Design a protein around this ligand. Structure first.
Ligand code: CA
Ligand code: CA
Ligand code: CA
Ligand code: CA
Ligand code: ZN
Ligand code: ZN
Lengths: 352, 552, 552, 352
DNA sequence: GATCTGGCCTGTCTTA
DNA sequence: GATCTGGCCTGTCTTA
DNA sequence: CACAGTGCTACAGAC
DNA sequence: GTCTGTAGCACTGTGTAAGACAGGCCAGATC
DNA sequence: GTCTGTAGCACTGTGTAAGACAGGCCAGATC
DNA sequence: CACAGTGCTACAGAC
C-alpha cells in the first residue's frame, strides 16, 4: 500500500521553488535548482537531501576542480544515465531556464567524483559541447537514454520556448509557444545531434512523462498549447542505431493517461509509479497509477491513493520529485499572515 | 467667469484633491452664485488625454529592434503575455507600466515650451538646429516595504512593491560642430518629486530575482534598443531628431549588487567600483582606481561558468573577484549620495558610542554596558541637539547629527581631553569634504573643497589609522571606502554626485503611499492603473506652470 | 464674482484642503480671470471664531461648583496648572482641551437652525416652550497606539494618544405636563465622524492610571458639576433653559474595567454588568440580571479597603466581587456593539479552526497541526468569500465572515455531515439575533427579532452545551456571555445598543491621523492645538449644511 | 569609603515609580507604592526586596486576616516606630496620594505578624482613626517619633496640598500649595491630634529631611514654594510631654544643608548619611554628607562621593531609598527607541 | 576506545 | 538524608 | 445593521 | 442632440498589549 | 487706512531584511 | 548641500 507522513523543513525553506529537480545518485538524493542565484553559503547551488526523524535537512555540496559551474535551471530535461561503460554514472541536464529568465540551450553531465571523508561527496559537471543541428533553447521537454546494438544514444523531445526573435515584442516578451515536434538524437560523443521529423507527431507538446527501456521510449500524457488540450493518447517511439544513419519509426497507441507534470518514481526493475500532476487546468489529479513496461508494450493499473490530508486535497497546486525506491517528496504552498516564512509544507509519500 | 479646463485640471492635480472631493466643491461653488467657475469632471477626463503617454505621433530611425511600431499604447500590464498554464511558473504579479519610448516621447513633448525658450535665449535660430539634440536620462528604481494587501479577488500577492521611474536631466545640442554641445535645458531641482516620472509599478519583493527579471526584462530590452536609433518628433512645428543617453544612478548599494551580479553585501569584495578586498582596504584607504564595468562583469561571469583554468571554488572566486551571477542591467559606475550620508552617519554614531565608554582601553565590553552607553548618548542628544532616539538612521537625523555642535555636545561626555580633540578634528575633516558629493555642481559652488579633497581624505584616513586603530584594524564600512577612495574621479568623470542621487525616487515613494490611499479605485485590478496615471500627471511641467505663472 | 467667507471656509474644511494648498489654489484662480472668486486666508481666520468654543455668552443656574464663571476661554493645556517642581511627579504630558461646558454651549448653539425647525414642524410655538429642554449627550474615550513622536524640544513623550470626545444624540422637550417629552431633534447618523466632537487630546498611554486620571480629573469634575444646574442660552432670540443627561458608552471593555475599578480582563469575574463568575456562566448561560452600578462599585471598594469583617484576601475578593480599585468615572451599564462583533467573530473563527481538525475526538493536537489547519482555513476563505488572512480581527472582516455563505464555504472542509448542520444551525441562530444589538432602533427596524431574542439565545446556548461541550465545559468569552444574557434588558432600558457604539470614535481616530499629517504645524508645542481646532471645525453642522443645501 | 554597584531588575520594571518607599522591618526591606492599582499578581501592593548576585528581585507579600488593605500611596510621610512597648514594631504611613490623584489623609500602622514558613512573612495594617483637630490631606511632608520622660508622641510637619476647595478651579486643578506651617502632635492612642503654631516658622515647607532623637527633631533643608527658594537654614524643635498640654519650643540654627528629597540612610546609633536629592531646580546634588546628632546638637561633615558613572552624573533626575545598614538603592530613568521596556537603571550604593 | 574532520551554530558586521 | 512547601515558570485564555 | 468615499463607465434626463 | 449628474461596482480605513490563572516542578529550609 | 501677500519659525516624511564570515564545538565515522 | 509644505504672527506695500 502507500503512506504519507508530514515532514518539517528545519532551516531551509527559501530554496525550494515549484520547478526543481531531485537526482538519485548512489542512493543519495540531491536537490538541484534553487530560488535565486547561488549564495555564498552554498556557491554550487546543489544540495544533498537527508530525510530522517520527520525532518528534511539540506547540506551544501561542493564540486571538483575540473568541473564547470552551473546556473540554477528551473525546468530542465533530466535523464538518469545508468551505470555502464565507459564512466558511470552520469545525470544529463538540458536545458531549463535561468534565474534571469533566459533559456540555457546547454547540456551538462553531472557525476560523482570522490568520497568521503565524513560522508562528504564531491560532484563534477562537464558541460558537453553540441555540434549539429543543435536543438533550440527550451524547457519542460524530456530527455531519455536508449540502447540499441548495443550503442547508446539520447532521445530529446517536447518543450516550450519563447516566440521567434522576429515575432517577439516587448509586449510578447513572456508568452511561450511549443517548439516544432521533431525528435533529436544526441550522441554523447561524438557530440553530434541529428533532428528527425515524424509524420504522426503533428504538433508539439510539453510537460509529458517519458519512460525508456531497451531501445523503446514511451511518451505519456502531455499538454498541447495550440489547441489547449491534454491528450489521453500515448506515443511509442522505436529507435535503432544503424551504421551510419539512425532509421527510426513511430506509432500512436490507443489510450494512455491524461496527465501533465507528474512524478514517476521507480519501484521495480522497469516499473514506476505515477503520483499525479494535473488532469485539467483547474483540477489536480488525486489518484495513483502503476506503470510497468515490457517487451509487449505498456501496462497500466490503478493503485489506491493514500489518505490525502484536507490541506493537500484542497490545495490549488503541488509539485515534487522522487526520492527513490518507491518514495517521493511533495510540497504545498502555504498562506498566512504574517509570512510563516516557511513557504511550503512538505510530505513524504511512500509505496509499500 | 469660467476657467480653462487645463487650468482647473492643474488646480485639481497639484493640490492633491480627489475627484470626489473636487466634484463636492464644484457643485457647491456652482449652487451659490450659480455661474459655474470650475469645470465638471468629464471635461477634465477629456483634457488630460493629451498629457498622458500614447497621444503624439513619433517614429524611430532606424526602427527599434523587437519593439512594436505602434505609437498609441497607453497603460499595459507588465506581465507582457505571461501564459497562465498551471504547470508553468505562476503569474503571482500585479504590475502596470508605460511602454518606455512612448513615455519618453510624452515627457519630451511636455518639455517643448522650455526647449523653445532655451533655443531663443541662446540666440540660436530654429530653421537651423534640428539635427543634433541630445537628452540625458537619469533612471532610478527602488523597492518598498509595508504595502498592505487588499482583500480583492486574486491572486495572492506580497506586501512589497517595486517602482521603476526616470527623469530628464539635461538636453543639449551639438550642431554646428566645434561646440562640445550647447545646453538648452537642464533640470533645476533634479532631486524633487515634481521631476521624477513613474514608468512601471509592481507588487514584487526586491529579493526574488526570478519575478523581478521577468517584469523588468522588456524595459531593459527597450533601453538596449534605444541606444542606437534616433527619435523624430514634431516639436515647434518642425520634425527634429533626438538621441538618448541613459544613466542608471538611482540605485542603493543592495540593488546595484543584485543587478550587476555581485555578492551582497558584507562580502570580502566590498566595492562596487573596484576589486579591492575588505582587509586590503584597511592598509591602503585612499588609493584605488575604478575598474569595474558592466561589460567586464558580463565577461567575468562566463569565466565563472565555464571555469576554463580548472580551479577550485576559492581560486576561481578570487580570479573572478566575486562575480558568480550573471549581470542583468547596466548600471553607471557611481555613488549614491543619500545612502552614503546615512551610512557614514551611523558609523559616526557608533564611534561616539565607543568613545563614551573608552573601548580603546577595555577592548571587550559587555552587552549591558554597551546598552548603558547607548542610553546616555541618546539622553545627551535629546538635551542638546533636540533629537529623539530613532529606531533606524534616516536622512534628517544624519543631517542634524554630523554637525560641529553635535560633536561638541558629545565631547562633554568623553573624559580624556585628547580624544575629544581627536574626534573634533575628525568631524571638521569630514565637513570639509561632504559638500563635494552633496552639491549639484561642486566645481562651481565649492571649488576649493573639490580641489582640496585628496589631501583632506588622506588626513581623515590617517586619523582613523592612528587614533582609532582599535576599530579599523582590518574592517571598514563600504560607504566609508567609497567616500575616501573614489569621490574625486567620479566627480571629474560625471561632473557631480548629488545631482544623480536616489533622493527624488525615495521622495516619490511618499506620493505612492498618498495616492494609493486617496486617489485610486480600491481594488487589486485597478489601483496600480490609477496610481500610475495620477502620478504621471502630478509630475508634468505643463501642468506645473499653471501654478507658478498665474501668481508671478 | 464673490463667495461668502462662510461658504468657502466650509469648502476648505469639508474637502480636506490644507491652508497652504487652499492659498495655492486661490492665487491661481485669482490671476487667471482676475476677479477673485475665493476669499483670502485671513478673512477665513476671522470667519471661524464664531464657530469655535468661547464666542457666545452663557450662564448656569445655579452656578457651577468649582468651575470658573468665565465664558470666553478657548484652547487650554490640559495640565491645568501642574507645578513643575523637580521633586514632584513629572509633567510628562502634552495635552490640550476645550473646557467642557463652553464646548457644550458651542455645539448646542451650532444646532440653532435644527432646534428651531424641529420646534416649528411639530407645530409647537416659541413664546411657549422655553423651559424644559433636555439634551442627551453620548460621551466616548479611547486610546490609540502608533503615534510617531517628533524631535522637537521637550519633554520626552510616549508614542500613544488618548482622545476624549462627545456627541449630542437627542434634544427633546417635556413642557407642559403629561407628555413624556416631545423629541425635537435627534441624530440621524450617530456612528458617523461628522457628529463626534473632540474635547480633549493627550499624549498618554491608556495603561498609566496615574497620568490619565490627572489629565481627566477636571473633565469629570465638570461633568459632575453639570448634572445639577440649568444652562441658559439665547437661541432664537429668547433665553432658554437646558438640562443635560450624560451617557458614557463609547468605551471598549478594557477601558470600562480600568475606569470602574474592576480587574482586567480574563478574570474569574467576567461581566461588567453582573456578578457571575466564569465557571458559573457556563452552567447557566442565559439567565443573569444587571446588578453593578457606579455607586455600588464606589461603596464596595470601601469594603475592600476597610475590610470590616477581617477575612483573607480571597474571601474578601469574593465578598466584593473583584472591586479592589477605586472607581473613578461613572460609566453607563451597557454594551459595545463594534467590539462585541469583533469578539464573536474571532470566537467563530476559532470554532471553524477546531472543526476543520476534529478536535472533538482528538482532544489534544500539536501546534504544527493547528498551524496547518489555520493555513487550510485561510486558503479556503481566500478562494471563496475572497478574503485575505488578517493579522488581527477587524470590523469589516467580522462583517464578511459571519455570513451564511462563509459558513457553507467552511462546511466544504468539515468531513462528517452532522457537525456540518450543527454549525450551520449555529450561524443562522446567530444571524437571527445580531440585528437586535446593531440596529439604531430595534423596536421599529426588526421588531420580531427583538421579541424572539430570549428563545433564540436559549437555543444558541443549548447547542453550545450539547455539541461543542469539548470547548465550553467551563470556559466562555466575556462578549459571548454579554451577547447571550444581557441584550434584552439593555435594549428595553435604553432603547438601542448600536446607536451608542464605539464606532464613531474609532472613525474619528482616522481623522486624527489625517489632520496630524496634513493640517497642523509640525511642532510638539502646537500640533495638538491645531488638530483640536480643525477637528472641531470639521464636525460642525453649520459648516456641513453649506455642502448639501447648495446642491439640493 | 563608598562603592556603587550596578544592579539589574530581572522582571520587575513596571512597579517602581519616582515616589516610592522602602521600609526596613527586621532586616528585610519592603517596597511600598507601585505604579497603578494592585494587580492580581500581588493583591497587596507591597513587595519584599531581595538583592543578591547583582540582581534585584521582588516577591509578593501577603497580609493577615484582621488587616485593612492599602492604596499605593506615592509620597507619604514615613516614620520608623522602633521596637518598644507595647507592640513592636510598627511603621507609620501618612498620607501620600492615591493612584487617581487624591490625597489620603489617613494614618496606617504597618507591622510584622507571623513567619514563616519558607521565609514567608505576613504583615498587617491598622488604619488608626484620628480625632482632632486632624491634619489635612497632604504629601511630601514628614513624620517623626519622639520620647519625653518617657511618653511617646509623633510630630508631623510640612507638605504640599491642593488649593482650598473655594479657590480650586478646573483650571487650577493640578496646582499645589504648601499647607500652613503648624506642627501636629499625634498621640498613637487615643488618636487625639493637636495643632500648634510657632512664631519662628512663618512659611510652610516640603520635601525636607527630618531626623529625630530623644525628644528633639531636626528639620533639614526643605523647599519653600511661595518664594521658590531652598533654604540652607536648619530648624530644631524641642517637645516635652506634660499632662495635659504639650508645651513646645523652637529655634532656628545658623546653617544646615540646602537639599530637597534626599535619602537618609542610617549607619550608626544615631548617625545617618545623606546621598543627595537636588540642590537647585536644574542641578542635582552629587556630594555625600555624614550627619551624626547628639545632645549638644547636630554635626555635619563631608564624606567623599563614590565615582559616579557618567550616566548617573548626566541624568536629569534620580530617586531611591535606604536599603538599610549604610546601604541604599538609586534609580535613573532610561531613554531608548524602542522602549527597553525596563524603565529604570538601578544602582546600589554602600558606605564602608 | 581514541582521533579526526566536516558541518552546524552563534555572534558580529554591512546594507537595507 | 528525607520531606514539605512556597514561589517560580510555562502555556493557554481574554481583551485589545 | 458604520459610513464617506474611490474613479470610471453607462444611462437616464434637460435644452 | 450635446451636455450633465448620478447609480452601480467592489473594497477601503479607523478600530492593535499585557494580565489572569491553573498546573507542574524545583530549590531551599526544617526534622 | 483698511486690505493683501509674504517672510520667519521649527520640524515633517519618503528613505526599513537577510546574508557574509570567523571561530568554536560536537557528532559521527574510521583505525 | 532635498524639498514642498505646516499654520500662525508680524510687517511691509498698495489704494
Ligand atoms: Ca531599497
Ligand atoms: Ca525605499
Ligand atoms: Ca482601545
Ligand atoms: Ca483605538
Ligand atoms: Zn573601491
Ligand atoms: Zn452578566
Amino acid at each position: 500500500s502507500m503512506s504519507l507522513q508530514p515532514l518539517t523543513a528545519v532551516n531551509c525553506g527559501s530554496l525550494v521553488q515549484p520547478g526543481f529537480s531531485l537526482l538519485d545518485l548512489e542512493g543519495d538524493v540531491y536537490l538541484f535548482g534553487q530560488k535565486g542565484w547561488p549564495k555564498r553559503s552554498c556557491p554550487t547551488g546543489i544540495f544533498g537531501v537527508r530525510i530522517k526523524k520527520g525532518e528534511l535537512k539540506l547540506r551544501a555540496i561542493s564540486f571538483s576542480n575540473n568541473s564547470s559551474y552551473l546556473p540554477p535551471l528551473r525546468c530542465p530535461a533530466i535523464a538518469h544515465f545508468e551505470a555502464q561503460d565507459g564512466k558511470p554514472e552520469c545525470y544529463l541536464i538540458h536545458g531549463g531556464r535561468t534565474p534571469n529568465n533566459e533559456l540555457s540551450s546547454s547540456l551538462y553531465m553531472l557525476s560523482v567524483d570522490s568520497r568521503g571523508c565524513n560522508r562528504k561527496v564531491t560532484l563534477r559537471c562537464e558541460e558537453k559541447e553540441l555540434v549539429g543541428d543543435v536543438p533550440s533553447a527550451r524547457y519542460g521537454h524530456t530527455l531519455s537514454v536508449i540502447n540499441s546494438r548495443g550503442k547508446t544514444a539520447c532521445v530529446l523531445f517536447g518543450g516550450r520556448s519563447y516566440m521567434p526573435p522576429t515575432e517577439r515584442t516587448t509586449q510578447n516578451w513572456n508568452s511561450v509557444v511549443d517548439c516544432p515536434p521533431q525528435v533529436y538524437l544526441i550522441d554523447l560523443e561524438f557530440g553530434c545531434c541529428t533532428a528527425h521529423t515524424l509524420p504522426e507527431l503533428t504538433d508539439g507538446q510539453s510537460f509529458h512523462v517519458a519512460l525508456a527501456r531497451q531501445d523503446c521510449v514511451y511518451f505519456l500524457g502531455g499538454h498541447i498549447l495550440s489547441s489547449d488540450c491534454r491528450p489521453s493518447r500515448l506515443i511509442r517511439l522505436h529507435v535503432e542505431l544503424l551504421l551510419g544513419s539512425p532509421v527510426l519509426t513511430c506509432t500512436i497507441l490507443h489510450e494512455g493517461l491524461t496527465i501533465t507534470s507528474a512524478i514517476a518514481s521507480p519501484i521495480g526493475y522497469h516499473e514506476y509509479i505515477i503520483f499525479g500532476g494535473y488532469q485539467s487546468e483547474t483540477q489536480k489529479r488525486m489518484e495513483c497509477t502503476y506503470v510497468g513496461l515490457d517487451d509487449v508494450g505498456v501496462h497500466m493499473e490503478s493503485r489506491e491513493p493514500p489518505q490525502w490530508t484536507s490541506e493537500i486535497s484542497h490545495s490549488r497546486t503541488w509539485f515534487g520529485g522522487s526520492l527513490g525506491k518507491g518514495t517521493a517528496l511533495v510540497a504545498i504552498p502555504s498562506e498566512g499572515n504574517p509570512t510563516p516564512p516557511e513557504a511550503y509544507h512538505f510530505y513524504q509519500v511512500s509505496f509499500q | 467667469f469660467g476657467l480653462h479646463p487645463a487650468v482647473c485640471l492643474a488646480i485639481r492635480v497639484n493640490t492633491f484633491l480627489s475627484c470626489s472631493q473636487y466634484h463636492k466643491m464644484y457643485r457647491t461653488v456652482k449652487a451659490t452664485s450659480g455661474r459655474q467657475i470650475f469645470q465638471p469632471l468629464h471635461t477634465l477626463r477629456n483634457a488630460e488625454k493629451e498629457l498622458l503617454p500614447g497621444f503624439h505621433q513619433f517614429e524611430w530611425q532606424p526602427a527599434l529592434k523587437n519593439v512594436s511600431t505602434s505609437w498609441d499604447v497607453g497603460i499595459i500590464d507588465g506581465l507582457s503575455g505571461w501564459t497562465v498554464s498551471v504547470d508553468d511558473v505562476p503569474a503571482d504579479t500585479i504590475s502596470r507600466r508605460f511602454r518606455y519610448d512612448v513615455a519618453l516621447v510624452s515627457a519630451l513633448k511636455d518639455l517643448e515650451e522650455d526647449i523653445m525658450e532655451g533655443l531663443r535665449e541662446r540666440a540660436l535660430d530654429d530653421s537651423m538646429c534640428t539635427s543634433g539634440f541630445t537628452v540625458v536620462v537619469k533612471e532610478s528604481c527602488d523597492g518598498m516595504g509595508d504595502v498592505s494587501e487588499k482583500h480583492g479577488s486574486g491572486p495572492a500577492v506580497p506586501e512589497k512593491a517595486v517602482r521603476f521611474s526616470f527623469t530628464i536631466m539635461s538636453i543639449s545640442i551639438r550642431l554646428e560642430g566645434e561646440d562640445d554641445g550647447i545646453t538648452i535645458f537642464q533640470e533645476q531641482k533634479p532631486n524633487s518629486e515634481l521631476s521624477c516620472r513613474p514608468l512601471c509599478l509592481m507588487f514584487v519583493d526586491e529579493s526574488d530575482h526570478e519575478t523581478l527579471t521577468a517584469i523588468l526584462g522588456p524595459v531593459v530590452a527597450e533601453r538596449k534598443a534605444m541606444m542606437e536609433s534616433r527619435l523624430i518628433i514634431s516639436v515647434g512645428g518642425l520634425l527634429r531628431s533626438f538621441r538618448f543617453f541613459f544613466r542608471g544612478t538611482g540605485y542603493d548599494e543592495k540593488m546595484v549588487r543584485e543587478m550587476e551580479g555581485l555578492e551582497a553585501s558584507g562580502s570580502t569584495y566590498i566595492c562596487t567600483l573596484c576589486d579591492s578586498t575588505r582587509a586590503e582596504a584597511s592598509q591602503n584607504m585612499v588609493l584605488h582606481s575604478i575598474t569595474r564595468s558592466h561589460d567586464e562583469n558580463l565577461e567575468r561571469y562566463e569565466i565563472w561558468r565555464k571555469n576554463p583554468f580548472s580551479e577550485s571554488a576559492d581560486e576561481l572566486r578570487d580570479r573572478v573577484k566575486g562575480v558568480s551571477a550573471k549581470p542583468f542591467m547596466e548600471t553607471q559606475p557611481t555613488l549614491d549620495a543619500l545612502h552614503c550620508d546615512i551610512g557614514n552617519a551611523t558609523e559616526f554614531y557608533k564611534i561616539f558610542q565607543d568613545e563614551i565608554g573608552e573601548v580603546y582601553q577595555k577592548p571587550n565590553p559587555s552587552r549591558e554596558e554597551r546598552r548603558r552607553w547607548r542610553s546616555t548618548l541618546d539622553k545627551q542628544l535629546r538635551k542638546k541637539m533636540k533629537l529623539k532616539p530613532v529606531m533606524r538612521m534616516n536622512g534628517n537625523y544624519a543631517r542634524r547629527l554630523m554637525t560641529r555642535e553635535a560633536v561638541e555636545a558629545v565631547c562633554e561626555l568623553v573624559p580624556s581631553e585628547e580624544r575629544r580633540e581627536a574626534l573634533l578634528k575628525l568631524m571638521d575633516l569630514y565637513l570639509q569634504m561632504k559638500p563635494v558629493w552633496r552639491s549639484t555642481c561642486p566645481s562651481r559652488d565649492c571649488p576649493d573643497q573639490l580641489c582640496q579633497y585628496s589631501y583632506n581624505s588622506q588626513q581623515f584616513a590617517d586619523l582613523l589609522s592612528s587614533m582609532f586603530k582599535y576599530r579599523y584594524d582590518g574592517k571598514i564600512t563600504n560607504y566609508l571606502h567609497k567616500t575616501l577612495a573614489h569621490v574625486p574621479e567620479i566627480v571629474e568623470r560625471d561632473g557631480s554626485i548629488g545631482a544623480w542621487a536616489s533622493e527624488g525616487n525615495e521622495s516619490g515613494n511618499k506620493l505612492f503611499r498618498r495616492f494609493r490611499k486617496m486617489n485610486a479605485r480600491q481594488s487589486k485590478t485597478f489601483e496600480l492603473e490609477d496610481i500610475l496615471k495620477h502620478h504621471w500627471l502630478y509630475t508634468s511641467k505643463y501642468l506645473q506652470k499653471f501654478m507658478e505663472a498665474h501668481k508671478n
